[PDB]
Design a protein around this nucleic acid. Structure first.
Ligand SMILES: Nc1ncnc2c1ncn2[C@@H]1O[C@H](COP(=O)(O)OP(=O)(O)O)[C@@H](O)[C@H]1O
Length: 259
DNA sequence: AGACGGCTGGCACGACTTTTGCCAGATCAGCCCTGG
């Protein structure tokens, strides 16, 4: 293991609590699930669970759920023996078999085709899956790790998620807290971000914030979570222009009329 | 002398031949290293 200084700021305790939980599960072997609001740093957390385990070496496949072809996934997952079907001429490695020793990270697990929810089924349990047209079975020691943003309990009843394919993906959820909740955290990430954008309009230095911005932001409920401060804060800098004086007003929304 | 019929050959269009272009891989057996 190591440290891997990853740009993931904000004390707020809620962050400390999830990090403690996330850090504690780093040496595990059981699949975890991250439930959080869209754009709450879920990506960071996925990636936390690997570069912190006892295999910071293994591979690390992205595995989008809606990124799959679907018609031809029966070989995009396990993958195949060269010559299994017309056209085949070289063995191809399934994502799972890619990811042996490493860990898979299904982005947006909620949005997934029904067919893909069943196929996966046995790749998770035990570790038996043979390539399409394959002559023998094998093993896979790829720890599973995925995170969503849409709630899954409702989905299980709704039938969009197999009632049975739920006990088996999640052994633990790391459920991140909402932006508004952290409220300490505001200020800080703001400021880190300002200077962020400051590097890149070629400018010397960011004068700061007026009280007027203190109020604007804090009053604002942030329903876009981490990006709201970024999209909102970085956008303000463009409007701010000259660095001689500190900015006081930042618009909440790009949408609607300007006069 | 002018029109009609015959002849040949160029060109076109399907039905059909033929000619060129691929590029390993996995699997099995003997020998060397090591455990019993
Ligand atoms: N704790 C944090 N502090 C500062 N910025 C963050 C934090 N977590 C995420 N971000 C930034 O905000 C964006 C939110 O998107 P992302 O992290 O992908 O969330 P999700 O994966 O849930 O969609 C990211 O691009 C990331 O750079």
């Amino acid at each position: 293991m190591a440290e891997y200084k990853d740009n993931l700021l904000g004390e707020a305790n809620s962050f400390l609590e999830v990090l403690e939980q996330v850090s504690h599960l780093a040496p595990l072997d059981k699949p975890v699930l991250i439930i959080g609001e869209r754009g709450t740093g879920k990506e960071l957390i996925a990636s936390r669970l690997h570069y912190l385990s006892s295999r910071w070496q293994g591979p690390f496949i992205s595995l989008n759920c809606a990124a799959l072809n679907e018609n031809l996934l029966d070989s995009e997952l396990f993958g195949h023996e060269a010559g299994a079907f017309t056209g085949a001429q070289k063995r191809h490695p399934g994502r799972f078999e890619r990811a042996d020793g490493g860990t898979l990270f299904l982005d947006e697990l909620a949005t997934a085709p029904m067919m893909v929810q069943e196929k996966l089924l046995r790749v998770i349990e035990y570790g038996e899956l043979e390539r399409v047209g394959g002559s023998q079975p094998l093993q896979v020691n790829v720890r599973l790790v995925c995170a969503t943003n849409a709630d899954l309990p409702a989905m299980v009843n709704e039938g969009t998620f197999r009632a049975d394919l739920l006990d088996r993906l999640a052994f633990d959820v790391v459920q991140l807290p909402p932006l508004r909740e952290r409220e300490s955290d505001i200020m800080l990430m703001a400021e880190y971000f300002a200077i962020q954008m400051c590097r890149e309009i070629k400018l010397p230095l960011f004068p700061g914030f007026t009280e007027r911005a203190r109020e604007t932001l804090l009053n604002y409920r942030w329903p876009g979570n981490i990006r709201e401060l970024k999209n909102v804060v970085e956008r303000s800098v463009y409007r701010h222009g000259t660095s001689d004086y500190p900015l006081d007003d930042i618009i909440i929304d790009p949408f609607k009329r300007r006069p």
